[PDB]
Amino acid sequence: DGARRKRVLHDACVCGWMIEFLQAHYLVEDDIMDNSVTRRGKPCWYRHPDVTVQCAINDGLLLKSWTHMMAMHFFADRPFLQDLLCRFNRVDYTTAVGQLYDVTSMFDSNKLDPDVSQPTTTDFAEFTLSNYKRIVKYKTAYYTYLLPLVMGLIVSEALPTVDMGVTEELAMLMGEYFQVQDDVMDCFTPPERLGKVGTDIQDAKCSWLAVTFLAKASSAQVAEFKANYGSGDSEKVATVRRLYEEADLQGDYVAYEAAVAEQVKELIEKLRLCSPGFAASVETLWGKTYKRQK
Amino acid sequence: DGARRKRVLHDACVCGWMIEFLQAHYLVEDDIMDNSVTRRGKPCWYRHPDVTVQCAINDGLLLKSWTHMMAMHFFADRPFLQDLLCRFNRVDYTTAVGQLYDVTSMFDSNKLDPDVSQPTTTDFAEFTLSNYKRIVKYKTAYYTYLLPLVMGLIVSEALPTVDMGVTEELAMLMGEYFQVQDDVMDCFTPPERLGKVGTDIQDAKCSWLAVTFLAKASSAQVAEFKANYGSGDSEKVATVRRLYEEADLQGDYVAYEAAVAEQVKELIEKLRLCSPGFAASVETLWGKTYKRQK
Amino acid sequence: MPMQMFMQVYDEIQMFLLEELELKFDMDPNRVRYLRKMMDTTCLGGKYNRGLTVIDVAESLLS
Amino acid sequence: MPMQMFMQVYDEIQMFLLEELELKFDMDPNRVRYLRKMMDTTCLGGKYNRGLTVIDVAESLLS
Ligand SMILES: [Mg+2]
Ligand SMILES: [Mg+2]
Ligand SMILES: [Mg+2]
Ligand SMILES: [Mg+2]
Ligand SMILES: [Mg+2]
Ligand SMILES: [Mg+2]
């Protein structure tokens, strides 16, 4: 009965694609929303010569639908189908909510009314580590780190066998870090290694660099920041890059990374106690994240 | 035991909102895709002064997610919940395909390749009744006519009692006609009765008027249409309008309506036969379609 | 009457989702009010033919 | 091995979706080819960490 082994392995593969197809749907839409140019070495889907912006928005939705179509096909007769889809839609919605947070992080939330125009915030009062942790918790951690673990547990019919409280803590922790890494690469990793041209400075995003810079910078540094942040101009984007370098954020990063790595280390041990096999595959996922070059 | 009646009714309203929230999602995004101005008397969501384009894309996405969140909350304990969500997502997927058909109807499909740029068709060989019917069947009929009927059937636990083969024929026919009506108003009904400004001509869409004109018109008429269609220019647009009046499309409309009205009448009787309570509700639904002014 | 109860449940639904957003997704009041306006502006103001059909079909068939 | 089967199932899924499209949505081969390039361009080319993690968790646990 290497048939259980075949069925689980195949279902895991399908679930793997569901997420990848979910990721794909998000990147197509994120790129339009972020005004990105390039992705995985090539142009963003909406920037392909024969693809119109309107058709790209719709292509993004097709992608999302395919996740449901593939699940319904392959898992039609499976007792976990209803549980799988519940979770998968929860995470997806939570990811969409996270994107609300990201996409509105540059407006003063008190002046956030549909009926009335507003520009980018000039005092950046919301650019706090608190608000940052929220953005990232919902826009990345859930779909990137918690969902793949849970989907693996579901097709293995082993979901109840792990400490979910701890698993959730792990997923939240590694997910934040992965995002902080995304934000640092978006600024200091060259586009050709990365596959994409960074748009966080230009887009006046609440990136980790922004929020950490602002919590330690003098007022001279902050003023020069507020003059140069959220502009397409390359001399301006080049200053912000300098202001980060000058504030030694590479130091805050190493420290943050170390703190994440030891807390991650502890939680995996709490998880190894009753659930040693899950603990291993979590360690691998960590292994694919920690100090990733990408 | 008016409890069943209360439970069924309440489930019915929730499903009704699932569909209205779905519709809503489709309109936020259709409006961006179609580059529309106005909707239901007010600006299109993405055209609200304090609603950025990026955020309206996302908001459309939250709308879709809410259909799932409401279902899962209200129907959590409900035998039919998985049946309901399967069907709902199929329809939703079918609708998004229909939109691909719509949005790409202006490009020669033989030269439809992402990697390579291409302008709007200059010959319109794809503006056929055949292709029109395909657009409309998928983008409008399923969600607008089949899906409401089906949902009422599911919460009433009455789905197996009716002739689905006929129900589907009826849905397809009424849905076609609804869209033919939508296409005509776009061009001839004034924007303040309609609540929106028509964009079909400007967007160079495969409307029923377009395909019906093209199949009957002269070489000369067609050359003039080819020189004025798919352009925001208001003289060009006014020409196209004139060409539709001149070609007496209103004749063909009246004829199509009647053929539709009797073929609909025949199928409702085929249905009244084993299913009089449902046929009555299909007659009301037809009632809100036949010669609507909106 | 179909329309009366249809809007009652709209409020139930809205209340549930907006509150869940506050309670479980850490959402601030400003954004909660944004989503209230979004939700009303995009889901309300049409004629609800799709929604009202479901109720009708259900009322008819409980016989 | 994990990757090799993961792509195997990619080609199945892709086959099912594109054919279902042809057979039940009345889709011409042109649009079908459009969607194949779109699917490969958007789903393929990353490091597949989320997908591969699922298979990984599944292999580790079946024992
Ligand atoms: Mg973004
Ligand atoms: Mg981005
Ligand atoms: Mg980034
Ligand atoms: Mg449209
Ligand atoms: Mg439109
Ligand atoms: Mg229209």
Residue-by-residue DSSP string for B115-138: TS-----SS-TT--HHHHHHHHII
8-state DSSP, A189: S
CB contact at 8 A, B265 and B283: no
Closest alpha carbon to B16 in C16, C45, C3: C3
CB contact at 8 A, D6 and D52: yes
A42 strand-pairing partners: A39
The answer for residues whose C-beta is within 8 angstroms of residue D12's C-beta and 6 or more apart is: none
Question: Phi-psi category of B147—alpha, beta or left, where left has phi over 0 and alpha has psi -120 to 50?
Answer: alpha
- Rounded to an integer, what distance in angstroms lies between the CA atom of residue C1 and that of residue A269? 60
Q: At what angle do helices A208-216 and A234-246 cross, to 10 degrees?
A: 60
> b/e string for A227-249 if b means 16 or more Cβ within 10 A?
ebbbbeeeebbebbbebbeebeb
Please list every residue in chain B whose beta carbon sits closer than 8 Å to the beta carbon of residue C53. Answer: 16, 148-149, 152, 281, 285
Structure tokens at B183: 């296409």
Please list every residue in chain A whose beta carbon sits closer than 8 Å to the beta carbon of residue B96. Answer: 58, 61-62, 65
Q: Residues 143 to 162 of B: which have CB under 8 A from any C CB? A: 143-144, 147-149, 151-153, 155-156, 158, 161
Domain residue spans of chain B: 1-294
- Rounded to an integer, what distance in angstroms lies between the CA atom of residue A214 and that of residue A244? 10
Whether residues C30 and A114 touch (CB distance < 8 A) is answered with no
A38 strand-pairing partners: A43
- Rounded to an integer, what distance in angstroms lies between the CA atom of residue A27 and that of residue A50? 18
- Rounded to an integer, what distance in angstroms lies between the CA atom of residue B24 and that of residue B171? 20
8-state DSSP, B160: G
Give whole-number Cα distances, A50 to B97, B98, B110, D44, in Å: 18, 19, 12, 19
- Residue B7 carries which side chain, given as an amino acid letter? R
Q: In whole angstroms, what separates CA C60 from the centre of its chain?
A: 23
Q: Tell me the resolution in Å.
A: 2.7
Structure tokens at B125: 């060989």
Tell me the CB-side half-sphere exposure of residue B194, using CA atoms within 13 A.
18
Give whole-number Cα distances, B125 to B105, B111, B112, D32, in Å: 10, 13, 14, 19
Distance B36 CA to ligand 5 centre (A): 6
Among candidates D5, D45, D46 on the partner chain, residue whose Cβ is nearest the Cβ of A13: D5
Handedness of CA D27, D30, D33, D37 (dihedral sign): negative
Please list every residue in chain B whose beta carbon sits closer than 8 Å to the beta carbon of residue A32. Answer: 54, 57
- Rounded to an integer, what distance in angstroms lies between the CA atom of residue B127 and that of residue B217? 13
**Residue A196 phi/psi, 5° resolution?**
-150, 150
Structure tokens at B75: 């129907």
Compute chain D's Rg from CA coordinates. 15
- Rounded to an integer, what distance in angstroms lies between the CA atom of residue A70 and that of residue A18? 7
**B1-294 fold:** Farnesyl Diphosphate Synthase (1.10.600)
- Rounded to an integer, what distance in angstroms lies between the CA atom of residue A146 and that of residue A95? 12
B39 strand-pairing partners: B42
Per the entry, the structure determination technique was X-ray
Selected residue of B93, B95, B101, B131 to mutate for chain D interface (largest D Cβ count, 10 A): B101
Whether residues A33 and B58 touch (CB distance < 8 A) is answered with yes
Beta strand ranges found along A20-118 (DSSP E): 38-39, 42-43
Give whole-number Cα distances, B131 to A203, A287, B160, B206, in Å: 41, 52, 33, 9
CB contact at 8 A, B282 and B268: yes
Residues A140/C25/A29/B182 CA torsion (nearest 10 deg): 160
Whether residues A69 and B100 touch (CB distance < 8 A) is answered with no
Whether residues B112 and D34 touch (CB distance < 8 A) is answered with yes
Closest alpha carbon to A37 in A235, A201, A199: A199
Closest alpha carbon to A166 in A263, A267, A261, A91: A267
B42 strand-pairing partners: B39
- Rounded to an integer, what distance in angstroms lies between the CA atom of residue B136 and that of residue B103? 12
Structure tokens at A257: 């990374």
